[PDB]
Structure formats: C-alpha cells, structure tokens
Amino acid sequence: QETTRVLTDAAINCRSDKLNGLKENVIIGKLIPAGTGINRYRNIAVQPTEEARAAA
Amino acid sequence: GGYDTPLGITNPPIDELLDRVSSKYALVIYAAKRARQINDYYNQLGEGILEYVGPLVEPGLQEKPLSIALREIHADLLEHTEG
Amino acid sequence: THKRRLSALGPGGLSRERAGLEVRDVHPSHYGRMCPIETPEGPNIGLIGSLSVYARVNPFGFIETPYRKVVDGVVSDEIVYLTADEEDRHVVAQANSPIDADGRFVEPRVLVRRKAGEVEYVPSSEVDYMDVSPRQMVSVATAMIPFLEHDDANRALMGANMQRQAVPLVRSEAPLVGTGMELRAAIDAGDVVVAEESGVIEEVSADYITVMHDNGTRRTYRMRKFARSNHGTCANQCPIVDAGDRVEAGQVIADGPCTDDGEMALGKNLLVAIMPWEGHNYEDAIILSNRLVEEDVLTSIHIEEHEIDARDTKLGAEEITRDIPNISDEVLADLDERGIVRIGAEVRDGDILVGKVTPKGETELTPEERLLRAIFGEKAREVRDTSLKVPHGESGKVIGIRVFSREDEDELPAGVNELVRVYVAQKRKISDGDKLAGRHGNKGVIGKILPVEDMPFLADGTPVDIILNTHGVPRRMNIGQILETHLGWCAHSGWKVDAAKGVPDWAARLPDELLEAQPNAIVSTPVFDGAQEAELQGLLSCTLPNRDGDVLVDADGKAMLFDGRSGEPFPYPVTVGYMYIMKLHHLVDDKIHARSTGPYSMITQQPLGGKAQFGGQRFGEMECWAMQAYGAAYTLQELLTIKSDDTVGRVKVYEAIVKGENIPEPGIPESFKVLLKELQSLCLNVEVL
Amino acid sequence: MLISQRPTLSEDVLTDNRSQFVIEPLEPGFGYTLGNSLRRTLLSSIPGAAVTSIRIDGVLHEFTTVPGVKEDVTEIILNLKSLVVSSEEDEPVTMYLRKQGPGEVTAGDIVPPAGVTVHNPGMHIATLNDKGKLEVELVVERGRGYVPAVQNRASGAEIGRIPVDSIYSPVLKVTYKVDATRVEQRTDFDKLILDVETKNSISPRDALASAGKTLVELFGLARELN
Amino acid sequence: MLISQRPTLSEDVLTDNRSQFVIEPLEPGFGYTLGNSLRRTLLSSIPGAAVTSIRIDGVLHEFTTVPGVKEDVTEIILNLKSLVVSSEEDEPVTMYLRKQGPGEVTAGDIVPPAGVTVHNPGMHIATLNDKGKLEVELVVERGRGYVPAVQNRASGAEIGRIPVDSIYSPVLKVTYKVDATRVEQRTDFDKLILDVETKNSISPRDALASAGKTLVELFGLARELNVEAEGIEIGPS
Amino acid sequence: NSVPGAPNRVSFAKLREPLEVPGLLDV
Amino acid sequence: LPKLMALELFKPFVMKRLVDLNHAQNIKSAKRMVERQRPQVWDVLEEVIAEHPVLLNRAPTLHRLGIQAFEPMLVEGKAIQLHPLVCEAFNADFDGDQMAVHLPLSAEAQAEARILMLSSNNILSPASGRPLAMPRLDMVTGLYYLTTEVPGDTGEYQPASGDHPETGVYSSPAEAIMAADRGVLSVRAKIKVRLTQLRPPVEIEAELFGHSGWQPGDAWMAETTLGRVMFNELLPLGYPFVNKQMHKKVQAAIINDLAERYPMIVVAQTVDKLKDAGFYWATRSGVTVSMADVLVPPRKKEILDHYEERADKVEKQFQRGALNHDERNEALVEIWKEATDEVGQALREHYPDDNPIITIVDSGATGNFTQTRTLAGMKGLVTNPKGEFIPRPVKSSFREGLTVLEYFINTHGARKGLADTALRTADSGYLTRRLVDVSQDVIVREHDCQTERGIVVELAERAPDGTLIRDPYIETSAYARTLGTDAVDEAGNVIVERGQDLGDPEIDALLAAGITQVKVRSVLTCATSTGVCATCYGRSMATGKLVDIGEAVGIVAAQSIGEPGTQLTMITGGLPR
Ligand SMILES: [Mg+2]
Ligand SMILES: [Zn+2]
C-alpha cells in the first residue's frame, strides 16, 4: 500500500534491491530463488561418463 | 531389498534414485537436462551427424525421453557436477 | 417456491455485507409467518426466507397467522388471524393437545408461548388461543418431507433446498409415501390443467381437449407440448381422461412436468439397500443398477436454444446464406436451400446450424498464397466464414427454428436485419457423475453402475436398484431417511393387521381402515403428526408374501441378500426398502470443461471464453503458495508466464510442441519490459545491474 | 471315499413360462457357485430379437405428437419398448402397422412378415379417435444383451427413421437356492434348485440349454486345450 | 451368434509349482462368472489320497506326550497331515512307520505297501532322543476337498486311533482377480488372473485341465437339454 | 380430500384440520 | 480422466503424434480430424497420454498437499475418478465436489511432477509427520472386523485332552483357508496355526531362535485368529507379527513405523493392499442401520422424572423469591447437564459391543459418542442465537421424534452453527495470508551454521516414584531435532553425541539414562544472515530425513499453522486467540 510514498523515497536514496526474497521474483516475473531455482541446482552439467559413452 | 515390481511412473523407484544425487531438486534438474539432450538427439538425426549422444539405454516402442533419462540415471551411466 | 419468497436484501433495504449476524438469526416471532428450516446455504442464510403455509399478509404489510380462540378451556372453532403485535400480549396454546370431543383440555395443564417468547407451562384456564394444526412453522417446500421430526435442522434444510432443483423425468411416477402437501401443491403450482366448469369430456388428443359444459357453450383447453423452460427442462403436458369421463370444477385434466395423476412426483421409488459394497459407494458415492438405464427410469429431456443475428457492418450487411467460403460439401448435407438446418437433423459437436457470412474487407496476400490460389483456380473472396456452429459436447435432434427479420416487420434491436434461433433436444440417461438425492438432504454423485446381474438380489431374484452407504446415516442425524425406507417396504408389499379377535395394543389408535392395505398402496405421514416409532414395528410384522408365501423382510426389517458377484450369501441380514429418490440438475455435461488454446481478451492477454468458448481455468493465489511450498519454480513460472500473458511465449511454445522440438526454457517474460516503461513515465530511472 | 456318481439335472414345470431345475448331488460348497454361474449367464448371454428403429409418416422426429392419437410420440416409443418379439431369420426384416378410426392400436394389431411373431397380442400401444390415423413401420433385428439406440447420423438413414433402444433378453427372472444336507459324518452333498422365468418368447428349457452351451464352449479353452 | 473374439489361456511359470495363468480378453462380465467356478473346482473337485487316522503306541489315555521324542502328540499330527502321498487302491490301506535308537525319522523311513507311494521322502516327522523306538500305524485313503477330522463311529469304542483332518485336494491355495483391459478397442473387457499353488503330487497345469474337464462334464448336463440351441460361439482354435 | 378426482392417499394423522390450506399463490 | 477432456487437453500433442503415422496430410488436416473426433485419434491418445503426469487441485488449496501430480489413464464417462486415499489430503467428498486439472509442458515441469508432486511420494503430512494415506471410514471398519477376536465362535480352539486331541490346530494358513471355505471354521475364532512365512514377534523369536530368528523358511506355531494371518499377509515380509485387533490408532502406528524403517516405495504398496482388504472385508462386515438397531435406554424415564423433581423444586424456589432469575437459570442448566450426562452413561451401558451403530464409532472409523447420545437418549441443551443456553431443555431424541417447540428451538443453534462455520472458514484465509506474507524470506541456505547456542526441552520431567514419565507433548517438541551439545547422564560417559536426529531409539536410550534436559539446536538461534541452515532447522517432516538446501521452509510453516484454522471453535478461546 501507499506505493507512491514507497517509491518517492527509494528513488531519492538511489536504493538498490537484492532480489533475495521469493516475492520480488514473482513480482518482476523472474524465477523464484527457492527449490529448483537455486543456482547450485539449475546450473548442473550433465554429460555421459567416458566408460558408458565408449559403448555408444 | 525385495518389495515388488513397480508400475509405470513409479518405476524406477525414487529410493534407488536419491542415492545418485544429493537431494531431489538436483535429480529433477539432472533428469530434465538429460531428457532435453535425448530429445535434441532425436531431432537432428536427419541431417549431418552431431555430437549429442544417447539414448544410452535401448528404449521401448514409444517411450518418453524423461523415462529413458531416469532409467539411465538409475543405471549409473552419466555423472554431473553441481554449481 | 420462487414466489412466496421474502428477501431482506435489495433496493430500499439493508445490504449483504453491511448487516451483522442479527437479522439472520431466527426470532421467536417467526413461528407461523416465516419458515426457519427453508433457506439458502450460501452467504444468504437468514436474509432470504419463505412464507409459511397458513400465513396471510395484512392490508398494511404485516404477516398474520390463524389461531382458534378457546374460551374457558373449551376449544371453539372461531378462527382469528392474529398479527405479530397482538400475539405476545395473549397466551397461545399448543397444536397437539388432548382435546376431548368438545374442546376441553383433558389434562389440567397445558404448554404455552407467553409474551416474551419463552416456552412456559400453565393451567387450562389462561389458554385463550391455540394453533389450528401443527406444521404451521413449516413452509410449503418443507411440508413435503416425511418424518421431518426425525431429521436434524441442517439435513432438513438441505432436503428442503434440494427439491426445487430436481428435474422432470419422462414418466413422472408418484411417491409411495409422502405427506398431504402433494395433491394440494400441484393444482396450485399452475402447471396442472384444471377443469374450469363441471362438464363432460367430448374429445381428447395429445394436443388439446374439449369439455362440453352442461349449459351449451363448450371450452377447449390447449396443453403445451415440449416447451422449453427457463433452465432447459421440458414443459411437457398430457391429458389423463378419456372421451366419456365426467369431470367437475377443480378436477385435474392434464398432468404437468413433475406431476402424476395431478400431484407432485419429483422422482422415482427405487429398491435400496444400506450396505457398503466393495468400496464403490465410498463417502457419499452411490451405485446403481443397469435397470435404471435400460428401462428409462431416470431418463430426462433437455432443450437448449442457440441464437445468431445478422446485422449491417461498416463494409456492408452480414448475410445468412447457404453459400460459404472455402469449405467441403459434406458439411452442407443438412442445411436447407436457404441456410438454417432442417428440423429433424441429428446434429453433433462441431456441426453447422446457421450459414452466416460477413464481408472480409480488403487485404493483400503474400506470394505463397497468391501462388496457391492460382494453382487451385479459386480466386479469393471478400467474406469471412463466421457461422453459428454447435458448441462443444452437445448433440440431439433439432426441434424448432424461429426466424425474425427487419424486412418482414419483425421488430428487433438497432442495426439487426435478421435473427434466428434453433432449439436442440436431447434425451439424457443416468450416468456416473450425475448427482442424486432423497428428500432427507442426503446426496451424492453416481460412481458406478453395475450390470443387472451382479447386484445383491433378494432371495427371489430381484436385484437391489441403489446401494446407499451406512457410514453416512449415523453421524449426520438424518435417521428419517431410514424410517421411510422401512415404511416404504410396507406400503409396497401391503399389510393386514392380524387383529381378527382384537386390535393389538400398538395399532389400536392410529386410524381405522388402516389395518390392511393392498400391495403397492399409497400412504401419507404429515410433518409433525404421522406414523410412530411403535407403529412401523407393528406394520413390519405383516408384510404379506410376494407370490409364494415367503416373508422376505423379517421383523427387524432386514433381508438375506445373495452376492451377485461371488455367488454366496452375505453372512448378515441387510436392511432393504423402497426409497423415493430424485435426479438433481447438476449433470456432468454441464460441469465438464477443458481448454487447450482458445480466445484471449484484447486488453489483458489472459485467456477468455464465452458461450462456445472454452474459458480457461483460474490458477489462483493459494495454488501459487502450494507450488512454492513444493519448491517447483519451473512449473509455477510456466503457469504464470507462457500460459496467461506472454504472447511471444504461447506461440513459441505451441510451435515447438507441434514441431516436436524442446519447449524453450522460460526466460524473463515480456511483462517486465513494460513495468520499466510505466516507471520511466514517472521520471524514475530504473536500471538492471 | 470319493463318493462316485454323476449329478443329474431334472426339471419341474410350474407354469407356462417358468420352471425349476434340480441338480444333485454336488460337492459341498459347490452348489451356490454353480447356481450363481448359471444365473449370471442366463441374464446376459441369451440371444433374442427386438425392434431396433421405427418410422412414422406424419412425424419427422421423436419430440412431436401425431394428430388424433392420445399419447405423444415418445410415449408410443416407451410403450413399444415392451414388445416381446421373436425373430427367426438373421436380417433386418421389417413389420408394418396401420390403423384408422377410433379405437386402440394394440401390439396384436401388427402384421408380422413370415419369420417373426408377436407373443403378447394383448399389449396396448396407443389410442385413436375418429380423426386418428396411425401408420408406423418397425425394424426387427437380432442380437443379445442390450444395445443403446444406434445413432441416426452413424448410419445413412433419412430424416424420418427414428432409432430406439433394443433389449434382447428372453429371460425375465432367475434365482436359486441350495439344500446342503451335510449330515455330520463326512458323507455330504448339495442340491441346487434353479428357478427360471422367461418373457413368453422361449421356454426355460431353451434358455438353460443356451446358457449351458455358452458355458461349455468357453470352459473348454481351459480344458485339455492347455 | 459369435463371440467376436477369442480368449487365450497364456500360462506363466513361477517357482516349480506356483504357476499363474491369465485369460484374456473376456467380454464383460465373464471374469467373475467363471473365475469363482474355476477356483472352487480346482479346490474341491480333484481326486487325491491323504491320511485319515493314525495311532501311536502309548497314547491310549495319555494324550500329550511321547517317550524319547522332542515333539509332543499334538504336533506330530499336524506334522503328518502335510505329507503328500498318492494311492490307487481305493480303500483304507494302513501303513506302518517304525524306528528305534536316537535319530531323526523322515518320510523315507516308512515302507508303503503296494499301490501307495510318497512324494517327499526328505520330510521331517520326529526325532527320537535316544534308546527309544517309535511305532505308528497310519491309514491312507482317497477323496476330494477337505474333510475335517472324521470322528469314527466308536467315540471311545476304538483302540485309541487319533482321527486327523484330511487334505485330499492336490492344490493348496487359489486366488484370482480381474482387470479392465482395452476399454476402448476392446470396449471394457476383462482379464482374469489365476494363481494356484499346487502340492507336489501333480504339476499346476495338469491340475487345471482336469478341473476344466470335470466342469465341462457338469455344465453339459444342462446343455444336453435341447441340442439345437443358439448360444455364444467361439469357433476353432 | 376436498378435491373432485384426487387419488386416495391413506393418512397416518390423528388430529383434525379445522382450517384448510389457503390459496398458496394468494400472496 | 474422461477421454473427452484428455482429448481436449492433449490436442497439440496428438495433432503431432498422428502426423508421423500418416493419418493426416499435414498439421491442418490433423487439427480438423481431431476437432471432428475421427476414430483414428483414440489410438494415438493412449500413446501420448502414457507417462504424462497431470496436476489435480481442489479449491480451496489450504496446504501444500492440495495440488498433487498423477499418472492419468483414459476412462469412459465424464467424472475424474479419484483414488479414495487422497480424499483426506484434499479434504474432498463425493457429494458434488469439483476438481481442476492442469497439464505441465516443459521437461523441467514433467520432472517436477514426477519427482516432487507425485501422489505416492507424499504420505506423511508436512505439519506433524503422521501419515495421510492411512485407511479411513470404510477400510478401517473393514480391518477392524477382519482382525477382531470373538470368543466361542465356530471351530474355536477346543483342546479337551482326555478323550481326543486338541482339534483346533492347523498345518498352515492354506489348510485354514480350505477349512474356512467350508462352514467348519470362522474367520474370527482363536486357533493355533503353524506359520512358516511370517516373522514371529520379537518376544517369541528371541527365545525360539536367539542367534538370528529370520522367517524365510522356518516354522513357529502361534496361537491367533485366522483373520490376523490374512492381515499380516499384507505387510512386508520382514516386518514382525502384530497379533492385535486393528483399531485406527494401531494402524496409524503401524503405517508410521513402516514410513520410518522402510523405503517410500513399500509404504504405498502396503497402503494399497490394506485399502483393498479393508473394502473387501467391510462389505462382508454386515454393518447396516435399521431403526430396530437404534436401541433406546431401558430406564430413561425414571432418570428424567428424578431430574424433573429437581428442576421443579428449583423453579418453585425461584418463584417463591429465594433466588433471582439468573440464579434459577444457571441452576436449571446445571441440573439438566447432569441429567444429560447420566442418560448418556446409561445409554452407553445398555448398548452391546457388537451393535453396528456403536461399532462404527468404537473403531475410530468416524463420528463420536455424543452424536449417538443425541440420536437415542436426549438431545440435551440447545444454545440460543446470542450464545446462552436454553433452560427447557430438549428432552426427546432424534429416534423418538421431537415436538414442534423443541424443533423450533433447535433450529436456532442449527443455523447459528452454519453461519459461524461460513464466517470462520472465510476468516482463516486472512490469517494464513498474513502468516505467508511475513515468513516468505525463510529458506534453507547453508548446510550448517556451525553455531552452539540452543534451546532446551523437558523430555519426561522426573517424578517422585515414577523416576521419569514421558512429557505428554514430546512428539511435537523433541522429535525431528538435532542435539546441539553432547548429552550425558550422570558422569558416566557419552550417551548420545552432538549431531543426532533424536528419533525413537535415541529418545529411548536417553530416557533410560535418566536425563530430563537435552539441549537441542533450533531455528530460534540460527547463525545465518538471511535464512536458516539445514542442521538448525532439524529434520524435515514430509521426507522423514534432513531438510534440503532449497526448501522454502517459511511457507510450509505458515500453511501448517493456517490450515487447521477451520477447526478452531471458541480472554478469547479459539482462532481470535
Ligand atoms: Mg462436498
Ligand atoms: Zn543455524
């Protein structure tokens, strides 16, 4: 609520956001940073092992 | 141990899958990426060969790529590295 | 019951959200004026009520009620309509008091209702007024529930609200055990053609009847056949007299939608057991027999009305014609030479009903299309194929076709040259998913329909029709639906009190001439004055044998069923009877919905539907909370971005699906490059770091 | 001891279209199952005839009324859903019905072609007055079980023809009961008394014989065949 | 009339004598119509031999003890009952089982007379502690089904021969359950699934065909009332 | 009761009905 | 899943999959053929539906078990056939409810539907840890009747040595079933079978085998009923024997034990077997309801007359002038409460233990005693519209038929309860909403903050002669926690070291040691800047093991607190508190 007076001061302070919670992402439509959205998970490298790939 | 023969979606069991991964989310992304690779594999077979490999396991008549990915994961045929 | 309703909300009165829970509670003055049982279940409890039976509206607007004034303990017959004001000042007696043949209160004291509203107890001298009969508090819709004094208020309310929702069947069989408000509420409902002046039938036909009054002039009644109601039901009507019968003023001549022999009959009598059967009737589910499908015992009719209009547009005027843009010739094998379909055509889902066409305008076709029209020698046209096609999941014959035209003096709204309507009929059988319900508020969907051969059948070979579950009876406090199940069997078999030497103690009171009744005999049990717990048990020990002397229902009222599926008999006697159930109007054909990809709103790109449009389901907020609680980010984002708004995403995923490629990973939606512009419109410089 | 003899099925006739069948002796616990297995086939797998579709001249569809008659068309349809007809030849042979003047069009007033027959000439179909003229042609067919109304658009029929539900079931009511002597000295047996009642189309003997054939020709595939 | 299909009996071999047959595709509803009948016939319709009554030397009045044997008298009985045996001379044919000195008695320790035989010689029957000889006299006869302990017509007038429950049926356990295969192409048919454990007197495949026979010779009684009938036909294999 | 050609529905009641139901649609 | 709805949802997929097999010239012809419902499609739809999980949901969606993934399979009709065990998690009943079906598209979506939201992976509630697929109304009275013991029934354990053998022992469950098919043996009669495939209870096997009393092939004669053998046939092979009549609490305990000691794929199959047996035996249970089975207390009128004398003397005292209005009102309320309770006790004394109306409740299947007391006996006191009791009170019972004034007085409370239920269900949403809006930033961040601070719990406060009786609410305070500081008894040595999960065995060992204070790490003192660490949060409630490093454990803890709000009835007593 009172978005007007919540913006008219953030702009002054030149404040920044961290997108740390899981409602900022849902607001700006970005992928929520919880569960399968964490970096450690959504940046997995998946490639067959050399042994198995040998059989092809 | 010995429980029963799983049916459809429940096969392979997750209890025998969560040992190849730290948690369930990592396994989710694992299977998703392996299935995406397999599906790319099927597309590009028409024109010149590509480097994408798979399916490592002989699939069935008409089988979705996600199930093939899960069967491959359960058999210890591909490794990963978390971020 | 749509009439006789009183809604405290609306213009000039209070509202629905600005009225505390004080006008909702029942006041001790409502006794005799407004029924406390009948009322909606939604957010309107107490705001919308219904008048009582005997009540009457004063000349000013105050509701009256009739009492009998007793003078010196001598109950007289001077009926006097009292209002709500001059009732508290006096002392009101009770309806069922031991009057002895004159109007004298046999006992020395009597129950009363004093001014305040309390329930006091007084001597038989102060009592001046007394109710005319019990059930004064009860409305009309409620006064038709047998054994109401055995049901809880919740279940009684649900039963009273689940009768105005029934549907009219094709046979409309009367109920085996009801109350006195059946015959006296159909002739007043206005759907029973009542003989006006006592005459003699002269000629009858499914279309009309003629009566020859004793004084010259005759009178012809015209019964309405297969007329559509406001909710899609059937308004059929059929005579019930022959060409010689004598009739008197008031007598019934033609039955109605749900009437039978001129009295309310909302459903059918079905043989019901009260055992749980291998998990198919689990938590209010119900199983039926195929007999109810083969013998059209719950088949109903439904008549829907589609409508289209042809107006004048900016480029010209829309024309309803048989001609059409690029189209086959097998989709025109039922349209008459002038568009609209022919009566009797068995249409189905997707077919065409009215041939409409609208001016296209003017465009410019890319090469690929011009090089295609030239090949197929079909020069383009300037019309759009906007016809009237049947919606999804709808079939049945075409009954009537109505057509109005401005050119033919058929007045219509502004800018409308023609307007056509088509009525489609359909006979719906009973099917798993259709809701059913008895009088006592018990309800449930139809979960399984076993073949006629695997169903618990009595020792004779008669299969039970419905199989209600037990665990629903006790904890809902509606044991009423059990008593009528017992009595329902008696009135079906027919009894004969063995008192051929002396009337047994239990049945030495109730009526005379009720100690025996031919099999399949009708009975009645007024709301608060009917059968007695100690009378059924007396009417259940005389249940004359069906064909060969063999009583099937023992004294307690339980048979010995054989398991039609396994073959052997069940180890314990089961309760069986005849219950009067009704098919409600909540069929699955109305509810079932689906949407792969339909139309989208123009202002907001979220999906949108209408009459023939899917509509799209609403993924609310708590669903997003659950999704987040699972940690499923991709599914949530997909439900939020490429299924609601992202126009460049929906098409880019549909193309991938249809081509068999991988669904592109959900990036940042385009609904984020609009927040930045809406901000910069305020001189706010927001930058992504 | 393996008491050695053969169950013998005898028949006791009670009325024209009903009768009891006593089979004994049987091994204990075997009577109920046998009776149930016979009843479960009698009620579902007996071949019979029944009118499939009908056509009336003055009516295009089923939701209208014919001038002169008392009941509308769907009522005549319902009354025609109880006709007990027994077609002999396997093909869609048709029957005709034509009546004029006041009276009652009873099922016994249909002219059945050679091969078919109506077994309840006392049924009541409709009633007419001086202005009533009722003409209808029915289509009799063959089959078993119960087949819902075959959609009109499914076939290439005209607008006039009207489909109707078909109930091919000569049997009407089947029950049974056992008398397990089982005298407690280890010499026991059962006694199954089936009881069958048909709709005057086929005698109980024929129904039971067809049931026996349907069960024998299907229990053999588990016989020495394997 | 023709069934418009044909159900196929497709066997399946579990452990040596635990076959599991399936029949498909049956038209609805025939799963239960013949499943329970097959079950009951397999259970109590096949001939077979078993022990009826026995007698142990020294148990006349003392009814729970045996000198020099670990097992009591109320355990040997339920230890013998499960002794598969086959006979062909239908009559009470007694056998004798005796053994002295410390040792474990087994099925092969008994010498069956002419016509009767044992199918599991390595069965444990009792153990004699030491220097104590046991002697037992059994009675074997044929029959069907499961007849409980047949209390002889002496109820005391006998020498003290314990009457034991008899298990004639070669099969030991049967179960079944149906399914709903191909509800659109086969339009909701049935898929029967039997499961028959058979004593080692005969395979579980030669103890079903015999049931089919004894049942086709019982449903024929009815079908031999009007030969010229019209039922549902299957045709050739 | 008090209707020319109504069916005969036996009743279990015990009391009388001095006043008969009004013209339900009177309101 | 109705084939029509399946064919509408999967229209694009089938449109494609019927192009490879040349059933249509091109995608346009395919779309037209599908919209015409040609016979070719029904063959393709079964090939495309295979292994394509769909998400079913029911509104309102209170807790995270309101949306569940399922493996669909075509079905005739127009109803979404649901499994009976998931009716509890959804709270849905079949009196006209409706459920919504969504379809996931991407690969990540299907992986999440198969791994996270699958139906058979969520048996235990995330709020308390107990199971939610446990049997209920029908399966409970089914197992209750399948396992109940009845003395004196047919074929009971006779043994009358002296003239013949015992005559109640069987070779094995096979012979028992063979003799039960006949009329000889009853399914609920004590016998002495000889089991060779069910592991005996710990007590027996301890002495009978000692070294390793496994039960693959070794016999052990046990005296029980036949029903309990048929029941333990259901549970896994290794799980020990039970031999107890299966009330609902016993089933809850057994399912929770399986959910702890065994993997997740065995519990589901066990629950399916249990539901099957439960239904099959509930049908044969013979549980009907006839007004000849609703017994009325034999001597209710005498109690009523006694309390009538009492209340009349009270009202006469009032009328005289001894006690004012409120005094007599409260005295009458108290007297009638006493009468209600005494009539309820008489009713409960009169009923037999096998009466259907009383067995449906005794087995925890559904309902409670109060309802029965209001059916037969006395209704009691009826609340007013404002909230005060009525001093009448309502005497008759719903099986004798109430009078007019009694019914009109009862309608008050009957309607007030409906209105209050509406209001309360509407207002619990706001509480859940604020709870979720305040605690959305709490998500597991690191594996262990490696701190030392921690709270302490009671764990069975000592006692005079009890030396130590378990704290009543221990399963909600000291379970699924991780010790912060090594726990030790009297000087002795280590009893349980830092970093354990404080399950059942460790709890038992600690209690044996005799310690009544164990310092447990908790999220009240987590050391991470933003979010909590897995070791501080403790064990997850759904999975049964340590929580993951991505779980949004704030919304879970908000929904667990906001969901049961609809049960909050009543300084303030209920939800307002
Ligand atoms: Mg509901
Ligand atoms: Zn921490």
Numbering used by the authors:
A (entry chain D): 1227 to 1282
B (entry chain E): 27 to 109
C (entry chain C): 450 to 1138
D (entry chain A): 1 to 226
E (entry chain B): 1 to 237
F (entry chain C): 30 to 56
G (entry chain D): 443 to 1012, 1024 to 1030
What do the authors say?
The bacterial RNA polymerase (RNAP) is a proven target for antibiotics. RbpA, essential in Mtb, is a component of transcription initiation complexes (TICs) that tightly binds the primary promoter specificity σA subunit of the RNAP holoenzyme (holo). The switch region sits at the base of the mobile RNAP clamp domain and, like a hinge, controls motions of the clamp crucial for DNA loading into the RNAP active-site cleft and maintaining the melted DNA in the channel. Here, we used single-particle cryo-electron microscopy (cryo-EM) to determine structures of Mtb transcription initiation complexes in three distinct conformational states, including a complex with Fdx at an overall resolution of 3.4 Å.
The first class comprised Mtb RbpA/σA-holo with one us-fork promoter fragment and bound to Fdx. The cryo-EM density map was computed to a nominal resolution of 3.4 Å. The us-fork promoter fragment was bound outside the RNAP active site cleft, as expected, with the −35 and −10 promoter elements engaged with the σA4 and σA2 domains, respectively. Local resolution calculations indicated that the central core of the structure, including the Fdx binding determinant and the bound Fdx, was determined to 2.9–3.4 Å resolution. The reconstruction from the Fdx-bound class reveals unambiguous density for Fdx and defines Fdx-interacting residues from four protein components of the complex, β, β', σA, and RbpA, including six water molecules, four of which mediate Fdx/RNAP interactions. Fdx binding to the TIC buries a large accessible surface area of 4,800 Å2 (β, 2,100 Å2; β', 2,000 Å2; σA, 300 Å2; RbpA, 330 Å2). Fdx forms direct hydrogen bonds with nine residues (βQ1054, βD1094, βT1096, βK1101, β'R84, β'K86, β'R89, β'E323, and β'R412) and water-mediated interactions with four (β'R89, β'D404, β'Q415, and RbpA-E17). Notably, the Fdx/RNAP interaction is stabilized by two cation-π interactions between β'R84 and the aromatic ring of the Fdx homodichloroorsellinic acid moiety and β'R89 and the conjugated double-bond system centered between C4 and C5 of the macrolide core. In the high-resolution Fdx/TIC structure, Fdx binds in a narrow gap between the open clamp module and the rest of the RNAP. Because this complex is not interacting with any other ligands that might be expected to alter the clamp conformation (such as Fdx or DNA), we will refer to this as the 'relaxed' clamp conformation. The two Fdx-bound complexes, with or without us-fork DNA, show further opening of the clamp (14° and 15°, respectively; orange and red in Figure 5B).
